[PDB]
């Protein structure tokens, strides 16, 4: 009797009666996420349904990670779980997991549409780098950060929704992932560069129409990479890059003109310089040349926010056991 059902999108959410007035908030790769109101806590929450997460390896490792690491990757800038629950009575009938989170006012897509403000942008970027620093400290390298999986409250507080990849749309993925040529921690830095440049441009930086067109749209802008970057590409992929035309790219001033930034001040003039110098350090193809999370936090555009104070594979059935026992703990 504790549960009721409601249509959400193309699906059915079955949730505890404390959650009321379910309104679609958006959708993603675990489908619809609903806003609701929590009567027992008297606030708004966001509810996401994992439909058969144990169904295959990739769904299962993702749900399982999300469920365990939410208990130890505590963060100021990482969203938190208020509640996890299934409407099913036993392991045998177990099907779906519902993840309940604090409700945030918008995603970054919505904030990118706004006019360029230097205090807002450096604040947001600071929080993002910090959230990511903490992801790394806990052994999590995300690899999939995009405006749609970062959310912000109305006072510009920011939280990363999820933990990303395991281990068409590649607009924000790093050159080292596209090419499947191995990665280190500064892979997340590239996604922060794409996001910051989009705040300046109000247009997707690398808006590819295919896996191939994505790579050109990146080389057309930043220029072709060096010989040392190349020699590290797995032999099939090495030929497609090396054998293309050489592209020269554009200077960061011509990638992000003066006309995109506020002005008629020396503050604004300094800030524009700082923004572009950070852009030029994040938006670098070769991961060996790309600024790290720590140096990005010390960057003069960002450091004004500093505050003295601060793998195994399993059976379907074993995954179901694992996930189910995690749901029965809190």
Ligand X SMILES: Fc1cc(-c2cc[nH]/c(=N/c3ccc(-n4cnc(N5CCOCC5)n4)cc3)n2)cc(N2CCOCC2)c1
Q: Catalytic site residues?
A: 144
Residues with Cβ < 8 Å from 272, sequence gap 6 or more?
258, 261, 262, 263
Q: How far is the CB of 147 from ligand X (least distance, A)?
A: 8
Residue 26 engages ligand X in binding (rule: CB under 6 A): yes
Which lies closer to ligand X via its Cβ, residue 14 or residue 148? 148
Q: Are 196 and 121 in contact (CB under 8 A)?
A: yes
Provide, rounded to whole angstroms, the least separation between the CB of residue 108 and ligand X: 9
103 binds ligand X (CB under 6 A): yes
Which of residues 95 and 148 has its CB atom nearest to ligand X in the complex?
148
Q: Does 151 bind ligand X (CB under 6 A)?
A: yes
Among 15, 22, 25, 177, binds ligand X (CB under 6 A): 25
Residue nearest to ligand X (CB): 28
| Secondary structure of residue 121 in the 3-state scheme | helix
Q: In angstroms, what CA-CA distances link 126 with 7, 31, 184, 268? A: 39, 29, 20, 19
> Which range, of 80-88, 99-107, 132-140, 180-188, touches ligand X by CB under 6 A?
99-107
- Residue closer to ligand X by CB (options 32, 130) is 32
- If 0-12 CB within 10 Å is exposed, 13-18 middle and 19+ buried, where does residue 115 land? exposed
User: What are the DSSP calls for 266-281, one per residue?
Assistant: HHHHHHHHHHHHHHHH
Annotated binding site for ATP: 25-33, 48
| 217 binding ligand X? (CB under 6 A) | no
50 interacts with ligand X by CB under 6 A: no
Cα–Cα distance measured from residue 292 to residue 186, given in angstroms and rounded to the nearest whole number: 5
Minimum CB distance to ligand X, residue 219 (Å): 26
Cβ–Cβ < 8 Å for 317, 225: no
Using CB under 6 A, pick the residue from 8, 13, 15, 30 that binds ligand X: 30
Residue 31 C-beta: closest distance to ligand X, Å: 9
Q: Return the number of the residue (101 or 297) whose C-beta is nearest ligand X.
A: 101
Helix, strand counts (H, E) of the chain: 12, 10
Span near ligand X by CB under 6 A; candidates 97-105, 237-245, 251-259, 308-316: 97-105
Structure tokens, 77: 């800038």
Q: What is the residue-wise DSSP string for 201-236?
A: HSS-SS--SSHHHHHHHHHHHH-PPPHHHHTTS-HH
Our finding on whether 168 is near ligand X (CB under 6 A) is: no
Give the containing element (helix H, strand E) for 23: strand 19-28
Q: How far is CA 259 from the centre of its chain?
A: 29
Question: Closest distance between ligand X and the C-beta of residue 216, in Å?
Answer: 25
Position 173 contacts ligand X (CB under 6 A):
no
Task: Give the residue with the Cβ less far from ligand X, 63 or 302.
Answer: 63
Residue 320, CA distances (Å) to 85, 166, 224, 324 in order:
14, 18, 47, 6
Please select the residue that binds ligand X; options are 161, 219, 278, 327, rule is CB under 6 A: 161
In the bound complex, what is the minimum distance in angstroms from residue 281's beta carbon to ligand X?
27
Residue 199 binds ligand X, judged by CB under 6 A: no
Q: Which residues bind ligand X (CB under 6 A)?
A: 25-26, 28-30, 33, 46, 48, 101, 103-104, 106-107, 148-149, 151, 161-162
């Amino acid at each position: 009797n504790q549960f009721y059902s409601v249509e959400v999108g193309d699906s059915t959410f079955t949730v505890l009666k404390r959650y009321q007035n379910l309104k679609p908030i958006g959708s993603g790769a675990q489908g619809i996420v609903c806003a609701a109101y929590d009567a027992v806590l008297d606030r708004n929450v966001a509810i996401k349904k994992l439909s058969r997460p144990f169904q295959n390896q990739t769904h299962a490792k993702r749900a399982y990670r999300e469920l365990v690491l939410m208990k130890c990757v505590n963060h100021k800038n990482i969203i938190s779980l208020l509640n996890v629950f299934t409407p099913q009575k036993t392991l045998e009938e177990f099907q779906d997991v519902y993840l309940v989170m604090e409700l945030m006012d918008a995603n970054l897509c919505q904030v990118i549409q706004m006019e360029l403000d230097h205090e807002r942008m450096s604040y947001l970027l600071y929080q993002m780098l910090c959230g990511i620093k903490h992801l790394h400290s806990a052994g999590i390298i995300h690899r999939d950060l995009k405006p749609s999986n970062i959310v912000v409250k109305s006072d510009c507080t920011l939280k990363i929704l999820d933990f990303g990849l395991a281990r068409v749309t590649r607009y924000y993925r790093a050159p080292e992932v596209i090419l499947g040529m191995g990665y280190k921690e500064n892979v997340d830095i590239w996604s922060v560069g794409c996001i910051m440049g989009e705040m300046v441009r109000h247009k997707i930086l690398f808006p590819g129409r295919d896996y191939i067109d994505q790579w050109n749209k990146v080389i057309e802008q930043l220029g072709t990479p060096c010989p040392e970057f190349m020699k590290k590409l797995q032999p099939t992929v090495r030929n497609y890059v090396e054998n293309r035309p050489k592209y020269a790219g554009l200077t960061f001033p011509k990638l992000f003109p003066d006309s995109l930034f506020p002005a008629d001040s020396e503050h604004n003039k300094l800030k524009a310089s700082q923004a572009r110098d950070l852009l030029s350090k994040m938006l670098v193809i070769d991961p060996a040349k790309r600024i790290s999370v720590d140096d990005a936090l010390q960057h003069p555009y960002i450091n004004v926010w500093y505050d003295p104070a601060e793998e195994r594979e399993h059976t379907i059935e074993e995954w179901k056991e694992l996930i189910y026992k995690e749901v029965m703990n809190s």
